[PDB]
Design a protein around this ligand. Structure first.
Ligand SMILES: O=C(O)Cc1cc(-c2ccc(C(=O)O)s2)sc1-c1ccc(-c2sc(-c3ccc(C(=O)O)s3)cc2CC(=O)O)s1
Lengths: 71, 71, 71, 71, 71
């Protein structure tokens, strides 16, 4: 699960509290198991900062596309 | 599941409580063992900040628009 | 399930409770998934702030997005 | 499992609290569960900074790196 | 376990705290436990800073490693 205490997002910033499911995630079943526990105390973002509190599911790189492409 | 406490939005800020499903998610994989609880205490959004409390199902962009050049 | 406890909307602020079905996601079919509990305690919106209590269904834009500026 | 005390992100900086699950993975060992513990106290990033707190699963080579082995 | 006190990343920098798992995963090992102690005190990086605190396991040979067969 995910848990956050204090998140500050100003100056055209944006924050998302959840998981990201891309249109590539079409393979999965129902299985109840253990899930990693990720939690943050304080996050201060300034200047179009983007806060992602959760896990990301993608195939084309990651959350954003700035560096490290396909080999 | 989400659990928010205090969310403050000022200066033309906008906040949404819930999940976002896109047209690309139409007839796809909505259930892939998404077992997680996203809890948050204080969220600050000043300066046209956007607050998204929930998970998304898009693919054609991670909520916002980001495009750069790697190496 | 979408729910809220206290919402403070002031200074040309607006609040909506329920769900939003954008025309980009077909007509108002209603009842598609809803597999998460979305509840917030206190939401403060001052200064043209927008408070949306519910999930949306769209593909043209993520609720509020019309930017065409590349970085 | 993963815990962060204070994280500062400025100037188009972004931070993700979770893990990176790529589409290169499938129903075969994807349930990494809870193994090692990663706890950071102070994280400061300014001017295009990316904070990744979590593990990565897939054949993307590496989440974000500069290049390969150089001479 | 992996712990870090102070991490500073400025000017196109990134900090990754976690373990990397290649698409091939581990060739067995039903007892996945952490048997390494990595405590980071203070690391400052300005200008193309790559901070990786965790376990290396990919298949390239830079910030990662593998076995591979030579011929
Ligand atoms: O704000 C709370 O009360 C704490 C908190 C808040 C959550 C929820 C938010 C709203 C909910 C609600 O509305 O009820 S519940 S869950 C919960 C905890 C879970 C995990 C914890 C850890 S421990 C820590 C580490 C970070 C660094 C380390 C170091 O320096 O040693 S240890 C971070 C987190 C996260 C954190 O404390 O913010 S606290």
């Amino acid at each position: 699960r995910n848990s956050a205490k204090d998140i500050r997002t100003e100056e055209r910033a944006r924050v998302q509290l959840g998981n990201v499911v891309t249109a590539a995630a079409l393979h999965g079943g129902i299985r109840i198991s253990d899930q990693t526990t990720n939690s943050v105390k304080t996050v201060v973002g300034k200047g179009e900062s983007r806060v992602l509190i959760g896990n990301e599911y993608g195939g084309k790189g990651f959350w954003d596309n700035h560096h490290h492409h396909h080999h």
